[PDB]
Design a protein around this ligand. Sequence first.
Ligand SMILES: [Mg+2]
Ligand SMILES: [Mg+2]
Ligand SMILES: [Mg+2]
Ligand SMILES: [Mg+2]
Lengths: 475, 475, 475, 475
Amino acid sequence: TSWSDRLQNAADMPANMDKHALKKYRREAYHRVFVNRSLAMEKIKCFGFDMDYTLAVYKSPEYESLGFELTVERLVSIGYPQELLSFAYDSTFPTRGLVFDTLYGNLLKVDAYGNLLVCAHGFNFIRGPETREQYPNKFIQRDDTERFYILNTLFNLPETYLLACLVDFFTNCPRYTSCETGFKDGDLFMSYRSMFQDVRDAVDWVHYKGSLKEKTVENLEKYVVKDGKLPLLLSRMKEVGKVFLATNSDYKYTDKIMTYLFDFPHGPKPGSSHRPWQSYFDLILVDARKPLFFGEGTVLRQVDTKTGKLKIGTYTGPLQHGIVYSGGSSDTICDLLGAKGKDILYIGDHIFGDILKSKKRQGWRTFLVIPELAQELHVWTDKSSLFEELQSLDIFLAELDISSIQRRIKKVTHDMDMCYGMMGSLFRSGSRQTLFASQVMRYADLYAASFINLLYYPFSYLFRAAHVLMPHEST
Amino acid sequence: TSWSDRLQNAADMPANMDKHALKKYRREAYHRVFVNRSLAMEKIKCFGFDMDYTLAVYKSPEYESLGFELTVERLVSIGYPQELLSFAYDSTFPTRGLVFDTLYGNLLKVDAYGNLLVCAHGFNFIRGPETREQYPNKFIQRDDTERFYILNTLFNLPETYLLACLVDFFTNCPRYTSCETGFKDGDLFMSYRSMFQDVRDAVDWVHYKGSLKEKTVENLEKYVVKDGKLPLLLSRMKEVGKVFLATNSDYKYTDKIMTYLFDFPHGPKPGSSHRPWQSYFDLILVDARKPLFFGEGTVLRQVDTKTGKLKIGTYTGPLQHGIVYSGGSSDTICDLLGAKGKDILYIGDHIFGDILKSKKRQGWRTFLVIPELAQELHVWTDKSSLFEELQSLDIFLAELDISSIQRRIKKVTHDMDMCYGMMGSLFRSGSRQTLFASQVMRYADLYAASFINLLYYPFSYLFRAAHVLMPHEST
Amino acid sequence: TSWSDRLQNAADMPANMDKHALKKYRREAYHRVFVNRSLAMEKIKCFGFDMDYTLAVYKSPEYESLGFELTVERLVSIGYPQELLSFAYDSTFPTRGLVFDTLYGNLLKVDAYGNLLVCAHGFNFIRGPETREQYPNKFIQRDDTERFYILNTLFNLPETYLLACLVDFFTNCPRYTSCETGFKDGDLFMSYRSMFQDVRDAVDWVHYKGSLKEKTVENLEKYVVKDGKLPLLLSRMKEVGKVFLATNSDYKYTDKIMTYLFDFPHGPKPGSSHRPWQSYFDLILVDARKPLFFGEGTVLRQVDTKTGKLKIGTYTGPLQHGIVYSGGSSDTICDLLGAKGKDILYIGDHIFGDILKSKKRQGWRTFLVIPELAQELHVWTDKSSLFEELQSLDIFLAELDISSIQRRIKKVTHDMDMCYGMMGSLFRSGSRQTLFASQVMRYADLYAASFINLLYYPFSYLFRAAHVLMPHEST
Amino acid sequence: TSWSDRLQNAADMPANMDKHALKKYRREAYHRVFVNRSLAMEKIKCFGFDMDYTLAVYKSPEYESLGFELTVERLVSIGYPQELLSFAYDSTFPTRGLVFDTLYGNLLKVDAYGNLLVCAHGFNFIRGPETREQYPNKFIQRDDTERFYILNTLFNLPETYLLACLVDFFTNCPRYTSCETGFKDGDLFMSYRSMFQDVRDAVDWVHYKGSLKEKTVENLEKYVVKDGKLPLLLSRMKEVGKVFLATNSDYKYTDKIMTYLFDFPHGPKPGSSHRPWQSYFDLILVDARKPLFFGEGTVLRQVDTKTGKLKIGTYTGPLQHGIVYSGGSSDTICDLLGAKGKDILYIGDHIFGDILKSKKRQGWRTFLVIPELAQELHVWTDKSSLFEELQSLDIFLAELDISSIQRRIKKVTHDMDMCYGMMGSLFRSGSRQTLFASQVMRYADLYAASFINLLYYPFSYLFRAAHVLMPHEST
Ligand SMILES: [Mg+2]
Ligand SMILES: [Mg+2]
Ligand SMILES: [Mg+2]
Ligand SMILES: [Mg+2]
């Protein structure tokens, strides 16, 4: 059972719109909209959407495996050793949000202050004292982007596993010599940083020049979750306000994916005429280049919808029916739809490019899709027993012999985390929250396993969060 | 009653060290150490200190008034109009942490997302709808440091008032014409940004070339809080670990101020031989240039303690008795004292230069001194009635006629805030926390009205904070 | 008669090596080595070579036309109007070294101080007074690289003509409206700067992703000058010193081109065994990325000569027989061949990337190939009559009615220049030298229509230039 | 006999304005205007002037000695050893235009390509082979401004000698240990780069905070050349065009110096009413901050001529009588006087800040004052014998035993150069021109020992330079 098996379960269901069914269905955690800062839906005038892993959720692990296979094949095509071809994607290893340290070749799980929570070299998990060799003070400057790359999106799951695969492979292949910062094979030296760049280069290449889009699009049912409730929610949003798309993908890929997402023999509800996906939007903007989009952007271009090519020159006209934009900036949306930032709820999965940047730079309201939350919620509810024991121990430790009491902490956190995978939960390692968890609470006003959970809330719900108090204020 | 009147009350008291007196005295809020993240004092090996507004608290409002007077006199000396001379510092206007917007000449109180909480143009407080003229979406990109200057330290209190004074004066002086971005007087145009730079230039100048140090040092009792409990706490720290000073001030000013802070006819306790302030420290470092200190720093220099001048050349020797350093970096301290970052508790008042930077860049533990917390606590406890009514209204608003219910919110927040001053509380505006409050919770592990509150806690106390849960985790 | 018709005339000749034949053949201007600063061939220990337009001269105008055709086809493929397809390359329009001004869409010929010598908007040559509208003071800051692009290499000849073609086409096509900085077609605006970037993008694309290499390599005789005297000169250099290749091209293209350059049924001289091109070199370095090569360079890589792919990792071994390098820096050559900069004579055609940068950054000796010099010399010798009249007028103008005397200057310069082409001589406009001419004299120690002219000079010739005197020094 | 002894000889002379006296007086080399590029005086509409070492020439060696003394005293005041106090300025050591290499502590004389011509470590002149230890290839990247500082103005003559003095002193003082990059004294390390920064800091300090202006102004006759022919030339320029001042000095210093330069009991000619210096100018601009002046500049300010302070705010009015400007840009002058760049002849002594930058960035015409040219001309004319022998040897060397022929070259260049000083001529070392000589020919259209030499040329002279030919063009 993958996490997209949960999302494709609730997606096979038409929506009963009885107002008592929605209110009851909503309270079940898998379908909740969780609230970090209060938000009055009545004050939202425009709903904006990312596409990949927001409107179009790729089925796991089929999709990660395809991208891992194509990336491996690209690396062998440029000179990496044939053995890579026998790697096979394993979804139980990687967790989103890890940090690859290009100096020492470790995958790290860190908290919001860059404290080490987990450290794996290949598939060898480094325990506390040994990590102090390379990380005295057990800490990284997580903003040193020359050394550290944060694998933040579901797109990075294949490379998260692949980096571990390569470090493992070269460590144990007798042709090579392990050094602190990479591998020697005679007179060639491959630094972990060189190796990491090649992987990054290869993932980009399969997305933009290799065959991943092609293989995706010729088997959409295998790779893309489709849900009849998406065209219903979009039309319901259009009655209360404006709806826009602002995606980084190009127009040809956007059109194929979006057409499939609406490929039902009805429109919004069973019985209605099907409508083209474009009619569900007041403003369609491709090639957005977020997060640069939320600063100065690029020049506003117009897509030739017939050919998929951009018209030559900078588009100067007004919003008009039928038009598709390329490039531009967030200010394109605000001007063309007559919106201020806090009239906008932007809905996306990139904690950095979609959410953090639209909040800090423009004051937009934010909705973070976290697809793994379905499986994360399952593990967290089912094995709540262990976390409750965790919190019990954490307190009796403070009253105080703790020779053996710290041992039961470190034991209990390990086996709690293992239920999620080898890199543990996306949101925590034991009693300690991750960087990712921290940025969710900090920059996502709302979050949910799927944006579809908005369908189960009335037109003008007021999402409510608890007010926050400083220590001295609750004294 | 200023906030330094509170601190100079508890400072006139010798410390009863009965372990039941400390535990009871400690529970009184004014003397608490408040905890944002748990901290095990037993694991702290080095205590490090800022000086100004940490070890040496300047009496308010005498000191702010002196700096305001000298800054005003400097501006008139370079050409500003004589009327400035009749300005007089008013401590009830400014609150620390405001943001001056150099484009439109407004002082702003913002929350952590840059949402406008208060907006004053001179002494005219701009209400909601009118702020939308200049701030559509009622938001600023608080990291656009070319436009926005955050007045963060107690040193900025005089210029916080002075900026309002000037905007007020030029607005109402018939010689000038108000424009959106400044004032015209015939063929001269003074932009708010030009004017702001002159004020900043003048404050620097009185601190580093004018007479402020001179007038301070020739009347230390008038300007500097002195507390017999400081040499006691320092010596107690020296028995459990190492103690260091790392201040931005130069050695001559540091020596005068520190000598006075120890100017008692006894040592640590009444009855003991007085010792020079230098003997309370294992490492003394002046000219630190924090926050650059916490990155690459500057070259390590050695102070000629006899002359107050720096020796020529880069100091290459070891830590040795008697030596004073200039420049260097945080890594100087770690090497020379054999410490990792989390063995260090650094104690200071600069939320940015002392606390935020030492946490994000080095993983140091942090203790934030907030001198105004004494008065803030008084107002918050005494007028708790109003905040309790505030939180009641905030909830019954969510159940729902709110024509009149929002009016009682906006009324009640105003008169709550007024009890603090015209710019309201340092930590909140009504039910909404400030940027400053947010950075306290985020980067200060501990905080307190005074670092002296550490004296009332046992040698190896474990400061405990509540563990944090994401919404879906408490579901 | 193109300029590569001259070079392919002298190239069809085997070399008579009688020492009286070389000395006599050498004195003919077409075969001279011209000298800007004295150079003692005996002190040269390494000869280094660029490839494209140095060892491999592309036949004109076949090659420029092919690149123009492919670039035009690429632009139409991305959306430019079909009419572009009817453009046809005209070799009589462009002169190398022109400056495209992306603001106003003009091709400019400038002197070393950026003074305007010629200004063409499309095919309309703008005369003096009208250029003052857009260029008051008739001058450009030629180092403002955001606005001005200097078309410096023979590779830029197709785009030099194409830029004029497009400006002409849009100016006169009634679908568009000419503005100061570009063209409007309804709601699309194409700035000259946008248009220029598209041309630059398209030329790069045909070189690195389109078919230009493919079409070149499948008809080498049509496109590439081949000369039996090249393998003779290379072997003669190898007896006095070391020989190296440092080209920006990749290894697969380098191998095809170089193999053809040595494709004779003999070796160095008729009668000798043919040898592979690689045996003529002590150090072969591809992917050089000059001029970055002459600063920090890139990492040294090793080419897998069997597959044409780079081996993975950084090459750490020594110079060894058979090895081909990728990347690296000029310091790779100096270390591996044991050379200082002034032991090196580097031979190339890029006045900036090959010559200027190797002189200013490393102190290398320099040999500039100028292929057009053959035709330039012909025009300059044959029509010397007119330049002699020019210099006569220039002086009698100084003795002084010059109403009519300036008119004969401006007339005589025009018809002198026209004998070269519509953009006039590469080296001058009338009595005024071009930027290009200035950088030749300034940074090329030697220059010549072909590097083959070195064959006609004895092993240890001392190339001699006149010593330079300041005005006050000849007083 | 210093070089300002020559300039103060011709300055004690009233100007006979007989047109045959000027034409004859002019031909004497000391009073020539030398011409690098032809210039038609009739086309000059504005004459612009620097002040220091242009209108106000400081008497040598009195002035350099005063600045050396004050700089030495400042260094001892901050901690340098007392022995510095016994240094005494020696005008026979330094030559303008040397390059201090902050890595190895050498003064270098270089040519335009950065080839080493002279290399002195302290007062030890390093001969060829030993310089190869630190400068393989005998070359420096003269644009690496982090390592190399070019001492370009007469203001740098005191520090040129002082740098040698310090390197000499520390090398030979037994308290210190010489290392490749500086000196050790126990646990202090003084790098040459640290030491160089202290000297630079100290020279700035005496100019802007110490007493150099004060001591200058209270003994102007001792320190400043005064010439009755200056007010005559200025008034003659005002009849043919506009005259402006654009100096980096502030208004109070400018007024003292300029007032003295006009302190005669007559006006332009003996017998005329004296006029204030300000009446000789159409536009006076102080605080120019050249060369930044020739790019974006700073904001235009207005000087309060009564107080010497800048008025508050940005000056927006027009050119009006009596007004003095501060800051601004070269475009201030062009707009306010209605000039294009080539209507301007700017007259100054800074080869970089005044001449090179105004030519490359704005296309201004240029007049370089070189005060040492008077003495340089004397040495060059009087000892022409030796340079003529030099050029004879340079040629017979090319015909060819040169074991002994190179020895007579290296001997003859040494004793030629010695007649100028220990660092030799400003313009050459033997047969090789210096960087400085090269930038004179390259960027100064005219040059002269004094700008006063313009008085001896008729109103609309056409300064004529020989036209330049490339090698292949004179073939
Ligand atoms: Mg996405
Ligand atoms: Mg402080
Ligand atoms: Mg080339
Ligand atoms: Mg000057």
